[PDB]
Amino acid sequence: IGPKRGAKVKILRKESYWYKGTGSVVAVDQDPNTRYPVVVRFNKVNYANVSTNNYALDEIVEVE
């Protein structure tokens, strides 16, 4: 803490069910290492019984 990890993130791949609606982050990766880190969550559910899905730093874009 003292930069920010999971405050609030919009989503913009334009497949994501949530897409824009901007909700919940979670334990986003501490690596240099891959291309699909970041969990996120929001309550607006989605098309499957369970959705909370993981998204990566491209782009991915704002808040701001």
Partner: protein
Amino acid sequence: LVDRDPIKTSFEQWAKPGHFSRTIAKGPDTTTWIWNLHADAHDFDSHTSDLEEISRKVFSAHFGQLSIIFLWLSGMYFHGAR
């Protein structure tokens, strides 16, 4: 489930979000389930694995109908008398 099992609540559950199949109605919201449940209010896959009661439920539902015909048709017989 556990609002609170067995021995120690008389206290009824009305509330906390309610029931079926184990990833039970989510918490998180949907419409379909309001259509589920009128449908397949009894199927008897669920409520218990073990027939146990149900025969102990279907005798009661039967009673309700016999009354009801009766509520009926008093009505009818009324109507017919007065």
